[PDB]
Amino acid sequence: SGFRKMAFPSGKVEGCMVQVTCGTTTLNGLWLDDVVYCPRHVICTSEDMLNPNYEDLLIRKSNHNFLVQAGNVQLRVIGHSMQNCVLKLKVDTANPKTPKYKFVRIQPGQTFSVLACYNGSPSGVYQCAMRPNFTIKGSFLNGSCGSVGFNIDYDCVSFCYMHHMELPTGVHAGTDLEGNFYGPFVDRQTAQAAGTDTTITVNVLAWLYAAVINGDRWFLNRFTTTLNDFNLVAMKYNYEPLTQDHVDILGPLSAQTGIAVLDMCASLKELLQNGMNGRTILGSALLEDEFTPFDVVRQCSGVTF
Amino acid sequence: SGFRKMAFPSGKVEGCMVQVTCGTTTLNGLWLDDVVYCPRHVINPNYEDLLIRKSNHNFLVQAGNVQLRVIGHSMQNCVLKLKVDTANPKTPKYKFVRIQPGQTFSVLACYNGSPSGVYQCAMRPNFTIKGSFLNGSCGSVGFNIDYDCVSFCYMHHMELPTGVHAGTDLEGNFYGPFVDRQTAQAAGTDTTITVNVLAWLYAAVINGDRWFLNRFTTTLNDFNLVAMKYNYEPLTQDHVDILGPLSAQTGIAVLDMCASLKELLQNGMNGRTILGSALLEDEFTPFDVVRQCSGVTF
Numbered sequence: 260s261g262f263r264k265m266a267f268p269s270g271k272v273e274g275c276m277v278q279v280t281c282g283t284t285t286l287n288g289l290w291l292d293d294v295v296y297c298p299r300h301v302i303c304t305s306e307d308m309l310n311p312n313y314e315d316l317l318i319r320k321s322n323h324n325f326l327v328q329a330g331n332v333q334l335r336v337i338g339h340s341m342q343n344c345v346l347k348l349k350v351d352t353a354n355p356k357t358p359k360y361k362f363v364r365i366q367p368g369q370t371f372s373v374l375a376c377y378n379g380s381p382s383g384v385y386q387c388a389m390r391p392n393f394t395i396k397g398s399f400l401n402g403s404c405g406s407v408g409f410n411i412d413y414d415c416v417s418f419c420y421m422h423h424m425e426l427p428t429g430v431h432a433g434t435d436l437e438g439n440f441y442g443p444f445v446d447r448q449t450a451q452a453a454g455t456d457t458t459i460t461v462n463v464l465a466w467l468y469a470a471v472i473n474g475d476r477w478f479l480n481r482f483t484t485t486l487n488d489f490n491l492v493a494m495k496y497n498y499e500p501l502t503q504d505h506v507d508i509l510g511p512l513s514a515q516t517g518i519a520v521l522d523m524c525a526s527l528k529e530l531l532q533n534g535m536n537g538r539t540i541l542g543s544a545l546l547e548d549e550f551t552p553f554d555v556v557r558q559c560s561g562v563t564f
Numbered sequence: 565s566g567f568r569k570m571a572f573p574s575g576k577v578e579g580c581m582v583q584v585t586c587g588t589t590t591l592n593g594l595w596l597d598d599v600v601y602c603p604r605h606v607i608n609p610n611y612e613d614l615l616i617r618k619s620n621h622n623f624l625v626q627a628g629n630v631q632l633r634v635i636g637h638s639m640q641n642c643v644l645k646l647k648v649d650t651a652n653p654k655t656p657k658y659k660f661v662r663i664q665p666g667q668t669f670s671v672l673a674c675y676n677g678s679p680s681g682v683y684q685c686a687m688r689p690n691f692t693i694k695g696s697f698l699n700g701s702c703g704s705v706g707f708n709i710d711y712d713c714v715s716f717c718y719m720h721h722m723e724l725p726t727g728v729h730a731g732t733d734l735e736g737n738f739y740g741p742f743v744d745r746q747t748a749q750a751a752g753t754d755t756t757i758t759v760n761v762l763a764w765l766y767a768a769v770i771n772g773d774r775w776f777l778n779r780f781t782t783t784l785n786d787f788n789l790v791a792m793k794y795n796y797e798p799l800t801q802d803h804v805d806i807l808g809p810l811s812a813q814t815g816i817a818v819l820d821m822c823a824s825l826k827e828l829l830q831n832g833m834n835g836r837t838i839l840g841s842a843l844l845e846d847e848f849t850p851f852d853v854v855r856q857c858s859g860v861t862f
C-alpha cells in the first residue's frame with residue numbers, strides 16, 4: 260500500500276555524468292561509450308546568447324579547447340561535432356560504466372526521472388512529466404545544464420531529455436539526446452515564453468484508477484458520459500482533450516477495477532465541478548497529473564483493495 | 565528555480581542490494597563488506613528458537629546472478645546478520661545512524677534484491693513512514709548522503725492496517741512502539757512537523773511565492789498554543805535556531821513566518837496554492853531546503 264511519486268534508481272546514470280568546460284562556461288555532459296553529449300551553448304558567453312551563430316563559434320574551436328572531467332580524471336577530447344542543439348565530444352576513453360541504453364524522444368504527458376547535476380556531480384533525483392506545453396516543472400539552478408531525464412524499464416536506460424534552459428515563469432526547456440528541442444524553443448536568449456499549460460487528463464484518470472485500487476471510491480458517481488461531452492467540460496477547466504487512444508490505453512485499469520473509462524470520466528467531471536470538500540485522494544488535495552497509466556500499473560498492486 | 569521532492573542519488577546503495585531467501589520467505593538484504601543485513605522475520609515467534617534450527621546453507625543469498633555463500637549468522641535486535649565469504653567490492657563509505665521524527669531520508673524500494681524505485685520521505689512524529697511498499701519490499705533501506713558517506717537510517721519490516729510503514733534502524737531497533745509479529749498494532753495519532761512546514765514556507769518565498777506573508781509577528785508561546793489546536797508539533801527554541809539561515813536569506817524572522825502559518829491554519833489558503841500544493845507540506849527539513857536551493861552535490 261501507499262502511492263508515492265517514484266523516480267527510477269539513478270545509479271546507471273550517475274556513472275555517466277561528467278563536467279564539460281569550454282573557456283569560462285562549465286556544465287554537465289553525458290559520457291556513453293567514447294562520446295560525451297552536452298548542450299551546444301557550452302561554447303557561448305552570456306553575450307553570445309542573444310544571437311549565437313553556433314557554426315561560427317564551433318569552427319574557431321579545437322579539441323583541446325574542451326576540458327572534460329570524469330571524477331578526478333581528465334578525459335582527452337579527440338573529436339567534436341554538432342548535432343542540432345547538442346555538441347558531441349569524441350573522447351579517447353570509452354566509459355567502462357556505460358549501461359545498456361537507447362535515446363528516445365517522448366511525447367507530452369510522458370513521465371521520466373531527472374538526475375540533477377552541478378559540475379559533473381549528481382545532487383538529487385526527482386520524477387516529473389513532459390507538460391502539454393513542452394516544458395518541465397523541474398528544480399534546476401545555474402550550472403544544471405546538461406542534466407538528463409530518463410526511464411529504466413528493465414535493464415536498459417532510455418535517455419529522453421537533456422536540460423538546456425529556464426523560461427521566465429520558472430519552468431524548464433531542453434532537448435531529446437539528438438539535440439531536437441521539445442516545444443517551440445531555441446537555445447537563444449530571445450522573447451520566449453511557455454504557452455498556456457493544461458492538465459494531462461489521461462494521467463489524472465490513471466491516478467483516479469490508482470485511488471480505487473488502493474481502496475478509495477468516495478468520488479465515484481452513478482453517471483456516465485460521452486467522449487465529446489466530457490471533452491467540452493474538460494476544456495473549460497484547461498484540461499487536455501481526451502482521445503480514443505487515451506481511452507484504449509486506460510483499458511487494463513478499467514478491467515482491473517470494473518469501472519469503464521467513460522464512467523471514470525463522469526467522476527472527473529464531478530470532481531472538477533465540486534472540488535474535494537475537505538477530502539483527499541491518495542494524500543493529495545489537488546488532482547495529480549504526473550503519473551501515466553503505465554506508472555500506475557508499475558507501482559500499484561495487481562490486486563484491488 | 566522550481567521545488568521538487570528530491571531523493572539522494574541511489575547508486576551507492578544499489579550496489580549493496582541482494583536477495584535473501586530462507587525456505588519459502590524471500591526479501592531484500594544490505595551487503596556491506598562481508599555481512600548481509602536483513603529483517604530477522606526472514607526465518608507468536610521465538611526468534612532465538614527459530615534461528616538455532618537454521619544452518620548457514622539454509623540462507624540463500626543472491627547478488628545479481630551470483631550466489632553468495634553464507635559462512636556465519638547472528639541476530640542483533642530485529643536484524644539478522646549473515647556473514648558471507650565474499651566482501652562487497654562496491655561497499656561505499658558508510659555509517660549506521662538512528663534518525664529522529666521529522667528527519668527525512670531517501671528510500672530505495674527493492675523486490676527480489678533488485679531496486680525498482682527511489683523516493684523521499686520523512687519519519688513521522690508517530691514513528692511511521694508514509695511509504696510505497698508492496699509484499700516483497702521487506703529489507704528495503706532508507707538513507708541520507710553527507711559528502712561521500714552513506715548514512716543508513718532505516719530498514720523496512722512491515723505495513724500497518726492504515727497503509728503506513730514501520731521498520732528499524734540498521735542495528736535492529738524499531739522506530740515506534742512496534743514489534744515484528746502478527747498482532748493488533750496500530751499507528752498512533754499523527755501530528756504535522758511544524759519546523760518542516762516553516763522551512764517549506766521559506767522555500768516558497770525563495771521561489772517567489774509571497775502572498776501568505778503579513779506585517780505581523782507572534783511570541784513562541786502564543787504560536788505553540790495555536791499550533792497544539794491543529795495537531796501541529798510544538799515549535800522549540802532549537803527549531804527557531806535551526807531556521808536562522810533561511811530567516812536571514814529571506815529577511816523574514818522565524819516568529820514573522822510563524823504568524824503567516826497561524827493565519828494559514830486559522831483561515832485556509834482560500835483557493836490559492838504554495839509551490840503547487842493546496843496542503844501545507846511537512847516532508848522537507850530546513851537542511852533539505854538549503855541544499856535544494858544551493859545545489860549541494862555527491
Ligand SMILES: CNC(=O)CN1Cc2ccc(Cl)cc2[C@@]2(CCN(c3cncc4ccccc34)C2=O)C1
Nearest residue numbers: 300308399400401403423424425445446447448565
Ligand atoms: C534564467 N535565464 C537566464 O537568466 C539567462 N539564460 C539565458 C539562456 C538562454 C538559452 C539557453 Cl539554451 C540557456 C540560457 C541560460 C543558461 C543557463 N540557464 C539556466 C538553466 N536552467 C536553470 C537555470 C536557473 C537559473 C538561472 C539560469 C538557468 C539558462 O536559461 C542562461
Ligand SMILES: CNC(=O)CN1Cc2ccc(Cl)cc2[C@@]2(CCN(c3cncc4ccccc34)C2=O)C1
Nearest residue numbers: 260605697698699700701702721722723744745746
Ligand atoms: C499487511 N500485512 C499482512 O497482511 C501480513 N504481514 C504480517 C507481518 C508481521 C510482522 C512483520 Cl515484521 C511483517 C509482516 C508482513 C511481511 C510483509 N509485510 C509487508 C510489508 N510492506 C508492505 C506490504 C504490503 C502488502 C502486504 C504486506 C506488506 C508485512 O507487513 C506480512
Ligand SMILES: [Cl-]
Nearest residue numbers: 364365366369
Ligand atoms: Cl512517449
